[model samples]
Target: TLQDIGVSAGINILSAFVFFIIFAVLRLQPFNDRVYFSKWYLKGLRSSKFLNWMPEALKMPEPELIDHAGLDSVVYLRIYWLGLKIFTPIAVLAWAVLVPSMRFWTHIVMAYAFTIWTCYVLMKEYETIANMRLQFVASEARRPDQFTVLVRNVPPDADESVSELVEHFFLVNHPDHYLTHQVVCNANKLADLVKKKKKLQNWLDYYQLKYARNNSQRIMVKLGFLGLWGQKVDAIEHYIAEIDKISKEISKEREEVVNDPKAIMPAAFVSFKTRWAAAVCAQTQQTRNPTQWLTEWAPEPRDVFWSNLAIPYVSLTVRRLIMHVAFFFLTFFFIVPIAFVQSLATFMKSVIQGFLPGIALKLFLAFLPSILMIMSKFEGFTSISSLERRAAFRYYIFNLVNVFLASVIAGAAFEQLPKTIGVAIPMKATFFITYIMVDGWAGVAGEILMLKPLIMFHLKNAFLVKTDKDREEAMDPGSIGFNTGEPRIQLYFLLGLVYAPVTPMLLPFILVFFALAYIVYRHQIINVYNQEYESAAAFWPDVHGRVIAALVISQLLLMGLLGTKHAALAAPFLIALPVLTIGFHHFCKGRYEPAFIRYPLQEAMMKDTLETAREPNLNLKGYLQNAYVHPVFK
Candidate 1:
């Protein structure tokens, strides 16, 4: 039966090689330039392409990477580096000494040492990341977000308009600091019209090129049901005519939106005269009614979730209440399919027993992050980073309950929870080893290949691409999917820590995962992933908390395992381990968490003074007048 694991590992290793081979060949193709070297294209940098991704990525130092790729990408790289730093030494100790000592006392003592080592690494990393974030923000150039606060839920005023209400409120409340304000518009209809016209215009351009390229022949097409139902027509002429109608409609809607008072939302971005003033307003309460005027630091222009700005303040609470109930039912019912797979897996052959269950589980999990993101969107977060952060939080809980806990119990998990916390963990080590090969090893290798994007680009090129602009639009260089990507890495952290003391054999597989993942993600960050929004390592605190949670879980599980093995006295001694770990977490959180959440007035005043000295006569009002406007208007 154990040979099933060997078979699964062999199959997974071969699949990883096949994916890598495809990547190696495809990345060198001239047509795939935008697909692989998109970051360079986006940055307008030139790259040499004689099989150069590996050496070039490896050669760049971390400080230079911070300058080249931004602090967010380099901080993400530090996560993998942190993993290798934490696990490599522990793997050495586990293999050298802990593997030979099978006695219960050895397990207790080494478990204590392992927890201490992990907490030390985590605390140091927390300090370093917090410092890096502070430096990155302090040294950055002047931007609109640093001097602006997004004020939401502005109360209605019978005497004044929403625009006038915002201007008067900030001017009276923040007399020395208020500079200007931009009111949000209920422009969803105008935005839709603009998008429609843009799509029609792209079609018009594509069809015009098609006709121009082959002037000897007439370009003909149907007009309905994907060009398969209606009577024949000239493609170029039809698109041109359609584009004209949408253009006229867009201008008409734009004018109506400008004049309509009901089209304005009760939210405005209020800019301040200095960073110190903006930080003061963003961090303090604004009005007597807590719900009337909500103030917060504004997300950058590109980071705003424009549609969510129009949701009423009261409706947000109801939406979240409905989503929480839906999430409970969703997680509860998700077990039915996995339980069915387990029941059917009993009669399967050996190789299927090892591989089929995990692959099926992965398929169920493939699109769950996107589903959770949509759910978060309904909860009405006004920024993309906040939405992804909430989604990542939900995803970790789902992975813990469904993947780790259920897989450990394997059948009727809720019924056996009290009985098998310790009795069944080591027995499932082989299952986890195979699961890592299936999910972690091959999963990371496949990321570099980007099969779906490759296929999509070719499909668009063959049918729709007619000019350089169309070809550029067709290239799918994606931003990092933080919600999905972060939770998956945390799952590996959970596994590695849980098994670090019990099954030392699982350590090497985890080590391979970190090493391979570091290389793959580094290459992706340098060449593929375009930065969408810069949060200056805002996710580091979450990362730290999750790792600490994993540490506490490992300690409690180890204690339970020992108690079940007739070491009741030893189990009592290990109770202090989690208590100490929690105490350490509290200290780190108090010391470093504030740096990520608040902007200190000292830093703000310093930057303000420096800027005043450099640009004494600058007209900031003119520069920021249209900075926060909706993209459709521009």
Candidate 2:
């Protein structure tokens, strides 16, 4: 009867098929247009006359020429390769020697240390390459006779007429001076002037003066104010004062704007002022000592290095250390209690299943709600959104379905096989494969489907609240923009932490599979972010396709390891893995590819800019192509 019930549970496998269909249907919607899957539709829309005639459209520029001839690309490559070689061996040793046999808690500690070390090494390697590139490129490039000076102290919503005054100032005072030719003004000099005068309490005052001065000269020149240098400064200062007065009046007029929501504006403005002061001081020093390069004359490297490293180091090392210690203590205190509860549950299940099956099922159903309610309290602390909660619920349901399917398969094997064969095959194999397929593949797919909308909605909300350009940039395109590829790998590690104690036998395989997947996906993501491939056709077939193939292979190997001897039995699932992975990918691509492909002319134009540029520069064009060409697929 138990065997028959197990067989009936096999129907849950159909849920997997249903889940995939749901994922496909979601991608077909117009709201999902920006995703890579909707490229075809986007392209089709772009080609239409309605789209072509749109006003105020912006087209991306082509890549700039990179002067790489003098730069030793080999040195960077060698260093990267060497670092990888060194780290690879160390990582393998840690995985092999330290990962297994450790107490569940200790493994987390080791993982944390491993992550920190890896991050540090990677950052150092990037810095090394960047410095090398800068050195080589700067040496070869022609030095400009005059560098452009940018003065900015004005508020974003400052008067347009004030900008006109600054442009006019330069025109009249330096008639022979090429307005197009860059003059690197020492902003520090102007900042110091404002500081000394104390005529301006804030940087906004300083910027107003700078902008007014530049504009006044330009306006004066247009109205014939040449050879009137002495009067020019007075005229500029007068115009700046008026602009400041106007701004104050405007600020008063818009009381809501001045009220300072969250005090964000004032804090940001002050921080910007301090930075401008420092920059102005550095530039002034550079101008005075022309023989001393700005880098040499500037503050010692310690300030830069320490300032950059201090917060990250403290947040990661010191703060994390405290958190980890607290966590360890908390976990230690709770462990015995949790274990006792689990053991009680196990004992109850045994009794209920053996003697009172109906009672047991009913009891489980009743207890499940209480357990879930308690878990819900903890989930609330994380501030997870409703969408994420829904997605997690779906993921859990899918996992349960897989678990049921595994129970059926295991039951059938035990019931049908001879004792010898049944004993030979590890019962854990069924459990392991079930967990991997459900938690790893199905879980990931569900999250991927939900991620775009969740991120976009939250980010949009964040942007509405705060108008920081950098914050906007950080939030745009979601978490991938901030973490690069780190978050994905970190998410896998987090999942590993939760799963490891429950199924230690599956831990090693999961780690290896995840590591490989992370490496492949990281490359693909970086390529996508960098805008490397113009179309999904150029990218998916290689990056996404190959990684999916690897995933399939890994899963097959896992199944074989589980003692599934029947090739026929394994063949169906093995074939299904790639077919599902590819089919899902293509389905996504078909829905989104048109949008990405719609900008072929724009891409071509960008390519031309890269080829035509005399000096090599790092711009969107070069960045995109380079990422595609050397994608992180390996």
TM-score of each model, in listed order? 0.91, 0.28
Candidate 1's TM-score: 0.91
Q: Give per-residue CA lDDT, model 2, range 440-523, as digits (tens).
A: 443433443445544564554433323433322332332222111222222233333323323344444454445433332232
Instruction: Quote the lDDT for 339 in model 1.
Output: 73
- Candidate 1 local lDDT, 128-188, one digit each (tens): 9888998888889888999989998999989899999999999999997899999999888
Q: How far is candidate 2 from the true structure (C-alpha RMSD, Å)?
A: 22.5
Assess the local accuracy of residue 619 in candidate 2 as a C-alpha lDDT between 0 and 100: 45
| Poorest lDDT segment (10 consecutive residues) of candidate 1 | 216-225
- Residue 104's C-alpha lDDT in candidate 1? 79
Estimate the TM-score for candidate 2.
0.28
